[PDB]
Amino acid sequence: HKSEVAHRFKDLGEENFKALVLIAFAQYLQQCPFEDHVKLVNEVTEFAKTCVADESAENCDKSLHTLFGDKLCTVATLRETYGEMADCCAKQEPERNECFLQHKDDNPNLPRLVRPEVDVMCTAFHDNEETFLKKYLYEIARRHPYFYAPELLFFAKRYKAAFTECCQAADKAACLLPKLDELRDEGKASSAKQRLKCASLQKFGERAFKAWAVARLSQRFPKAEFAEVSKLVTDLTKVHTECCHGDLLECADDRADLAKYICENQDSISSKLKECCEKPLLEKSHCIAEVENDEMPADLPSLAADFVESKDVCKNYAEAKDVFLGMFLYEYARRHPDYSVVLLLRLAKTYETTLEKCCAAADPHECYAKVFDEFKPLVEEPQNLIKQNCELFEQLGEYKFQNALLVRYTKKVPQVSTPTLVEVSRNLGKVGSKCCKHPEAKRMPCAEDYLSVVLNQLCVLHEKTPVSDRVTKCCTESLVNRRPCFSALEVDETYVPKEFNAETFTFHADICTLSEKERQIKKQTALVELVKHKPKATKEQLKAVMDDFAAFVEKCCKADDKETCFAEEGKKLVAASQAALG
Ligand SMILES: CCCCCCCCCCCCCCCCCC(=O)O
Ligand SMILES: CCCCCCCCCCCCCCCCCC(=O)O
């Protein structure tokens, strides 16, 4: 270990090394050419090979941070392409690195990546598969500077493993795309999740974050002892803090250590880690973070024993509140892998509130005795919402479900952009699709995972373009009662119907050719606009109107000559509805 580069190069391998060096140099230097970055990776790769041969060879001793920042500072243009950033090069050892991290422009101003055509992609991917994948890795990398390099490399393998399995099929497009979409979705969810966690950290402090991590890791490792859990919650919190900070090398080291640790005390944490701990250094932490819940001892007492019945609760509580409450989450969480973390945190905050009222009364034990009773309501609240919503999603398909939501929310916050109201109705509908397929045991957790990112995106958007104070209240409210805040939104009885506009409800024959996913966008955009014009409409007046419009295009799409029955039968419907809705 005389050489850091040689060790990582040897641990990682030439292939993964060249890839990670690329992703790393593309996250900083996100305005440089591909050919330019490729010249670096080759320089740095030949260098690391030198150190592998002779660990005492010039510079091989230097640390990765020094070697890395040293290479950056050699970029000829740097100053004219980046300016301010080039001033970092005047600083020393630790400041220099911190300087670069500061100028790491999150969300750059690069053109959307337009997905080529299945036939061109598949041809590019054969005529030179390496520079094809590397050229795209580079593309995605520069667009997501805070995306964890190793994980960004994990997707770039499923992408490669898709072009492999599809560009050889009869119907390549039928193969490729649906996976290229599952991936796009996945990578987008992953990125949103990471940004989400780094915000909760900053916005709500580590206390809140720790409370989250406890509940989460307790469900995951129900066999582990609270002391172990605490140990992990601590390491875990220090890892996130610095990965959030953006330092890849620092963050990478911290994650490797923690994985190495967890893998060591494997039998002390959980039985479902065998597989993950067999994998290489690169995919170990990632594997573990995704691991499945272990089975709970089954020989677990009652929470009421140590937390509601027994006396000295106030005694054990006052001694170290946070640790006592942390003991409650851990106890409750590992017994309920079927609950959502926020639901668990909601029970802990409630417990915390009672304890803070009873422990100060004449007869404490008599005050908090009925506590577990106050939990019932909080538990059934998300439970009922999930049942009623999945049952409905089963009657009407996804699309007709997405429509149901559309009407519901547009009526709550009519002030919202239609295109955005549609986007959210489609995303929420997917959540019902992905999640309702699960048994009642894994539903609430699923819902939380998905709704969380959606509700956040919703909020970051609203941040930029404020629309309703009510949405702001929920968005700025506590991260634990954020969703319930949205669930409590009410029909906007103050909204003033948007004046009619023929053009808005004017349909053409093109609606006949538009893809299913386009035919829907328009039927849906019209549905929103319709609810925005007559908000007091009923689920029956709307059902009727939607029905007329249904057969409307059927007897106009299948009709000899469209552009006519579309403008003829059209006025009829607009005029007919205008009245049947008055
Ligand atoms: C245009 C600027 C962005 C602002 C967007 C605001 C959109 C508001 C729509 C409200 C949809 C939130 C539903 C979340 C699920 C609530 C759960 C439930 O109904 O039980
Ligand atoms: C008072 C204003 C009257 C306006 C009359 C316009 C009538 C057209 C409304 C558009 C509604 C779109 C229906 C979308 C439902 C799609 C149903 C389906 O395809 O199964």
UniProtKB/Swiss-Prot annotation:
Cite the binding residues for (4Z,15Z)-bilirubin IXalpha.
K238
What glycosylation sites does the entry record?
Answer: 10, 49, 135, 160, 197, 223, 231, 274, 279, 311, 315-316, 321, 349, 376, 411, 437, 442, 492, 523, 532, 534, 543, 571
**Which keywords annotate this record?**
Calcium, Cleavage on pair of basic residues, Copper, Disease variant, Disulfide bond, Glycation, Glycoprotein, Lipid-binding, Metal-binding, Methylation, Phosphoprotein, Repeat, Secreted, Signal, Zinc
Which SMART domains does this one have? ALBUMIN
Residue numbers carrying N6-methyllysine: K532
Q: Does the keyword Disulfide bond apply?
A: yes
- Where, in this chain's numbering, is Cu cation bound? H1
Assembly? Interacts with FCGRT; this interaction regulates ALB homeostasis. Interacts with TASOR. In plasma, occurs in a covalently-linked complex with chromophore-bound alpha-1-microglobulin with molar ratio 1:2 and 1:1; this interaction does not prevent fatty acid binding to ALB.
Q: Which family, according to the similarity comment?
A: Belongs to the ALB/AFP/VDB family.
Record's protein name: Albumin
This protein's species is Homo sapiens
Q: Which gene encodes it?
A: ALB
